[PDB]
């Protein structure tokens, strides 16, 4: 699952895990 925030593309198996680092940046 890839969550994208401000040009940052976080692709991790779990959306929650992805968000956990993604929203930590974004």
Written description of the protein model:
It is classed as de novo protein. Keywords: synthetic designed peptide, de novo protein. The assembly is monomeric. NMR Solution Structure of Designed Peptide NC_EEH_D2. By secondary structure, the chain is α+β, with helices and mostly antiparallel strands. The protein contains one helix and two strands. Strands 1-2 form a two-stranded antiparallel ribbon. About 10% of the residues are buried.
The fraction of residues assigned to DSSP E strands is: 25-35%
Shape: flat
The span between the termini is 17 Å
Number of domains: 1
Number of strands: 2
How helical, in percent, are the residues?
Answer: 40-55%
* Whole-angstrom Rg: 7 Å
Strand order of the largest sheet: 1-2
The helix/strand class is alpha+beta
Order of helix and strand elements from N to C terminus: EEH
Major beta-sheet overview: 2 strands, antiparallel
Number of helices: 1
């Amino acid at each position: 699952t890839c969550v994208e925030c401000x040009x940052v593309k976080v692709c991790r198996p779990d959306p929650e895990e992805a968000r956990r680092e993604a929203e930590e940046r974004c």
